[PDB]
Each structure stands twice: as structure tokens, then as C-alpha cells.
Structure 1
Amino acid sequence: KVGRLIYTAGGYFRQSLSYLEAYNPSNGSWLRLADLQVPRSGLAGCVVGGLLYAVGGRNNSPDGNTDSSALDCYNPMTNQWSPCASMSVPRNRIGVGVIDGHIYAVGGSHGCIHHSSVERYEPERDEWHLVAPMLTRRIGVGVAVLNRLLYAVGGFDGTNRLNSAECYYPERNEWRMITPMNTIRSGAGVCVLHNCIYAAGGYDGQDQLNSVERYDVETETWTFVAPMRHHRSALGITVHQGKIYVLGGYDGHTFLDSVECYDPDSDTWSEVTRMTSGRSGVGVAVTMEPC
């Protein structure tokens, strides 16, 4: 359990960013690590076998926008990124989840296309394959895995921002709708903590949100918990040692540098650190500290 850092990859402030920075909750420190090979925002992060993966996104630059089909792998033992097999299609504003060592890439956009497609990466074989598509096209979708079931929450289908959510049952290669959230959320942070799927923040079509709700996978209800201190959309999120961390995002005025931490025992959020600069659209995951 000891020695794990919260890694934040990529993001957006004025343009897409190549930063990889890692926060140590035990001592408050931040480390700047090897930049991504290509600046990306709208990507997702995940970890399999101790390696950090950066999935999808877009490179917004002064010279244009390129949606990414890339999968790149960062090894903390070498502080180096290596390319992996690319996805079938570019996916900006993607959601990712891991089931039993396999990476699922969910939804996202490619230009004006809003994907319902989903694909699964096998690290052993360095191969992607498509699986059943979602019932809804979703970009800016939040994804989390609980009990080897994969949840896709919220997003934007091209016309409407969504309160709907759905679950993927791998042994049946099938998606089914779940109870919709109480709030429309595009670009929420979505994670798992204990027996619930949390959706924090997002954009409802009108305002950036500070509200947070959680789906109990047994009772099939969504319940609001304490709101974050800051409204935020396009935030990074992860869970570490039984607490949710939210990183950055956009509040309607500022690209936030704040990191807040949710304690489920007290049902409270606290501000724990600040990133080195404000940014939105980051990928976040937890793995061992580097060499």
C-alpha cells in the first residue's frame, strides 16, 4: 500500500498540455516527470500491472486540433513513455475503465462524430478489439468499474447533455441502462468508492456543478453527498486510500489548480493541495512512485 502517487497526465490551459506530474498525499510533494510524447487533453488515465496508460484525447494547438487514437504507457521504474497499439478510432473526451487487467475505452468524439463504440485492450497481446457499443452516444462520459461491471455515466450525445447512465456486463457483452442520475452531467469526474459509483461536478448545459451524487449498485438509487467547495467540469478524479481526489477542471471563470479530497466517513470535502498550474481535461491514475 505504501509509496503510491496520484499521477496527472496532460490537460488543457490555452492549449493541450504534455505535463506528467505526480502528487504524494503522504508528504504534500509534487514531482514533474517525463512529458507525454504528444500534448493531449480530453484523455483518460489508468493503471495495469504498475504501468500508467494515457488513452485518447486531442492535441489542441495554435496549428489545429488532432483527435487521438493513441495508447501510451509510462513506466515509473524508467521515467519513460512508450507507444502501445492504437485504438480503432480517435476518441477525445473519452472515458476508461479497467476490468481484470483489460482497458476499456468508451465513447468520446472524433470531430463532429459522437461515439457509442467501445473497445478493449489486452496488454499481454498489445491488441485492441471492439466490444458491444453503448446504447447511447456519449462524449465527456465518466467511466468507472465496480465488481467487474463497467459503468458509463452522463456525457453529451451531440444534441443533449445527459443524466442517463448504463452498465456493461462483460460475460454477456451487453449494455443495459441503469437508473439515471438526478442531475445532467457532461464532463463529471466518475469513480468508484466502496459500493457506489460517484459522479462529481460536470456541466449541465447551463452551469458548472459542485454537486456530487453516488449510485449504490445494490439499491439502484442515486443519492447526493456533500458538494465540492468548487464548481468544476472536465475535472480529473481518482480514489486513493478510501478517499476521492478531484483535480483541476473549469469553474466557468478559472482553470482550477485546486485538489479536493472527499472523506466518506465524515461526508466532507477538504482542499489538500494545488497543482503546479490550473488546467482542465487531465487524465489521472494511481501507481507506485518513480525512480
Structure 2
Amino acid sequence: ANEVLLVVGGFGSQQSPIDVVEKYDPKTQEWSFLPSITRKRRYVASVSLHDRIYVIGGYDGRSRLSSVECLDYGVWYSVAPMNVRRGLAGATTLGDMIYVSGGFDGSRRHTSMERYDPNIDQWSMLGDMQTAREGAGLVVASGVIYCLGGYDGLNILNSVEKYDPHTGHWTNVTPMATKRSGAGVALLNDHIYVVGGFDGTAHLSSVEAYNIRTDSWTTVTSMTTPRCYVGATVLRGRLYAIAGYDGNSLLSSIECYDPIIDSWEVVTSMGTQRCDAGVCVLRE
């Protein structure tokens, strides 16, 4: 109810990382600027936690970053950095903490995951995944974290790993039908949706959804356009695919998937053009 979409950083039309922060209101369909981040960051991830926006790692065009900055939803300020420089990492929240896994530090793709406690402003290293992954999102469903696809430095991946906080271990679940890197991922009505990405040859408009109860993937109606390094978030029971790269140009549009009609609609074409930005939801 009155949630909005937030999009930060990424790769802009001047072919460099940017600092632009925008919010989109699906109801009014209006965009607006927020205060710019301090360091320009592409390949960056964002989460929201208790009316706080976090912008995590990324890449300034020179080095991969472990630094993190925060905005109270306003002025941006620096908090404790991660232990690993990470571009194109997955990021999510679970029980008042941030989890970040995988990524690329300019030399190695990571298996590692670490966790942020806002109560003490510290990042703690957790268990490694089985496969090193850049370009893989994180998604939480019912207390458990899923890391989907990505790229290990040699192959685009269709494998999916599951982290159980009760065991502290990663295990495997049934893989996606398509190898995907740079896809957007979100939970919608207890299904994990994976939109777009890159399969090694083509930039994808295809979409798959994972039924967690039955451990099975099924094909979903494709998006209006291919989108790689695209963000995905759910608002009011609908799935949004934000900006990205269609294989030719940067995109400024957001399209919205509605299960009632089982189709994708463009809901705006007026954002800044960008890809590998970070996205999250704000409760106003």
C-alpha cells in the first residue's frame, strides 16, 4: 500500500557508472529524483531495510568496491564495508539483516556470502556457495535464501542453490530451464520469477517461474523486449522489470507482469536509461 520503486546507480547513456537515484510510483506513474549517491557505481546492488536504503559495492569504472552507503528515507552516509569487493553480487534481506553473495572483484568470481547487522554495523562471512557466481540474484522465501544462475567465469549458469540458515549450508534445487546471467529475480505469490538475462548467445526476453512447493520450473509469457542486467521487484502483487539492456541499447522503460491477464505491459518509458543498477521497494 503506497509502496514505490527505487532505482540507484548502474551504467548510463554516457557509457560510465552514474550516481542517479530515482523513485517510480506505479499508482501515479510519476518518477522523481532523490539525492544522488556519493560514488558513481555500476554493477551495484541495493536493498531496503527498516526505512533505510542500502547501496552495496558495485564498480566506479576504476575498481570493484566493498564500500556501502545508506540513506534514511535525506543525506547519504557511509557504513561498514563488506569484506569482499563485489560487482554484480546478489543481495537480499532476512530477519533484519542483509545477505550478499557472489560477485566479481576484478580478478575472481566469489562463492562467498556475508551478512550485515545494522544493530552493530558489521559484516560477517558465512558459508560459501558451491559455485562461484557473478550476475546471480538472491531471493528469500519462507526463511530460506535462493541464489539463481549467473556466471562462474567460464559458463553461464542455470543451477540454483539454497541456503538454510538453520544448517548454515548450501544445497542444490532443480535448475532453471535456461542458463541466465544478469536476470532479474523476485518472489511473487510464493513463486520465484526469473526475467530476462543473457544465456551466452542471446539477450533474453523469456521468463521462468519456480514453484517452491513442487520444486519445478515452468515457462511464463515473455517480456515486451529482451532485458539483461535488469532489476525486478514485486509491488501490490505485480512483477516489474526495470530498465536493462536489450542487446542493442539501454532501456528507460519499466514493464509490469500481471498474473490476472498473464501478460506484460509497459507502464512507463520515462526513467533514465541504464542497466546493472540496484533496485528495491520503499514503504514511503
User: Which category of TM-score, normalised to the shorter sequence, fits these structures?
Assistant: over 0.9
Q: Are the equivalent residues in 2 in contact too, given 1:250–1:256 (CA < 8 A)?
A: yes
Q: Are the equivalent residues in 1 in contact too, given 2:17–2:60 (CA < 8 A)?
A: yes
Q: Does 1:163 align with 2:158?
A: yes
Q: Does 1:75 align with 2:72?
A: yes
**CA distance in structure 2 between the aligned counterparts of 1:152 and 1:275, rounded to whole angstroms:** 31
**CA distance in structure 2 between the aligned counterparts of 1:133 and 1:201, rounded to whole angstroms:** 26
Q: Using the TM superposition, give the Cα deviation of residue 277 of structure 1 relative to its aligned residue in structure 2, in angstroms.
A: 2.3
Q: Using the TM superposition, give the Cα deviation of residue 276 of structure 1 relative to its aligned residue in structure 2, in angstroms.
A: 2.9
Q: Does 1:66 align with 2:67?
A: no
1:105 aligns to what?
A: 100
**CA distance in structure 1 between the aligned counterparts of 2:80 and 2:272, rounded to whole angstroms:** 31
List structure 1 segments (4+ residues) > 3 angstroms apart after TM superposition.
Answer: none
**CA distance in structure 1 between the aligned counterparts of 2:129 and 2:282, rounded to whole angstroms:** 29
**CA distance in structure 2 between the aligned counterparts of 1:220 and 1:266, rounded to whole angstroms:** 24
1:237 aligns to what?
A: 232
RMSD: 0.9
Partner of 2:145, secondary structure, is strand
1:39 aligns to what?
A: 40
Q: Using the TM superposition, give the Cα deviation of residue 264 of structure 1 relative to its aligned residue in structure 2, in angstroms.
A: 1.7
State which of 210, 217, 221 in structure 2 corresponds to 1:222: 217
1:271 aligns to what?
A: 266
Q: Deviations over 1:206-238 (max 9, x none)?
A: 010000001111100011111100101000111
Q: Are the equivalent residues in 1 in contact too, given 2:208–2:220 (CA < 8 A)?
A: yes
Q: Are the equivalent residues in 2 in contact too, given 1:248–1:275 (CA < 8 A)?
A: no
Q: Does 1:96 align with 2:91?
A: yes
Q: Using the TM superposition, give the Cα deviation of residue 68 of structure 1 relative to its aligned residue in structure 2, in angstroms.
A: 1.0
**CA distance in structure 2 between the aligned counterparts of 1:89 and 1:236, rounded to whole angstroms:** 22
Partner of 1:249, secondary structure, is coil
Amino acid at match of 2:69: D
**CA distance in structure 2 between the aligned counterparts of 1:274 and 1:149, rounded to whole angstroms:** 35
Q: Using the TM superposition, give the Cα deviation of residue 101 of structure 1 relative to its aligned residue in structure 2, in angstroms.
A: 1.2
Amino acid at match of 1:195: D
Alignment TM-score, normalising by the size of structure 2: 0.97
2:57 aligns to what?
A: 56
**CA distance in structure 2 between the aligned counterparts of 1:275 and 1:181, rounded to whole angstroms:** 32
Partner of 1:66, secondary structure, is coil
**CA distance in structure 2 between the aligned counterparts of 1:7 and 1:70, rounded to whole angstroms:** 20
Partner of 1:59, secondary structure, is coil
**CA distance in structure 1 between the aligned counterparts of 2:251 and 2:166, rounded to whole angstroms:** 40
**CA distance in structure 1 between the aligned counterparts of 2:10 and 2:159, rounded to whole angstroms:** 26
Alignment of 1:249-260 (within 5 A): 249-260=244-255
**CA distance in structure 1 between the aligned counterparts of 2:270 and 2:51, rounded to whole angstroms:** 23
Alignment TM-score, normalising by the size of structure 1: 0.95
Q: Using the TM superposition, give the Cα deviation of residue 5 of structure 1 relative to its aligned residue in structure 2, in angstroms.
A: 1.6
1:282 aligns to what?
A: 277
Amino acid at match of 1:148: G
Partner of 2:282, secondary structure, is strand
Q: Deviations over 1:91-144 (max 9, x none)?
A: 001110111111000100001200000000011111110000101000011111
CA 1:202/1:49 → structure 2, altered by over 3 Å: closer, same or farther? same
Q: Does 1:142 align with 2:137?
A: yes
**CA distance in structure 1 between the aligned counterparts of 2:70 and 2:233, rounded to whole angstroms:** 18
Q: Are the equivalent residues in 2 in contact too, given 1:12–1:282 (CA < 8 A)?
A: yes
Amino acid at match of 1:12: F
Q: What residue ranges of structure 2 are gaps of 5+ in the alignment? A: none
Amino acid at match of 1:9: V
Query: How many residue pairs are counted as aligned between the two chains?
Result: 282
Q: Are the equivalent residues in 1 in contact too, given 2:253–2:271 (CA < 8 A)?
A: no
**CA distance in structure 1 between the aligned counterparts of 2:68 and 2:186, rounded to whole angstroms:** 21
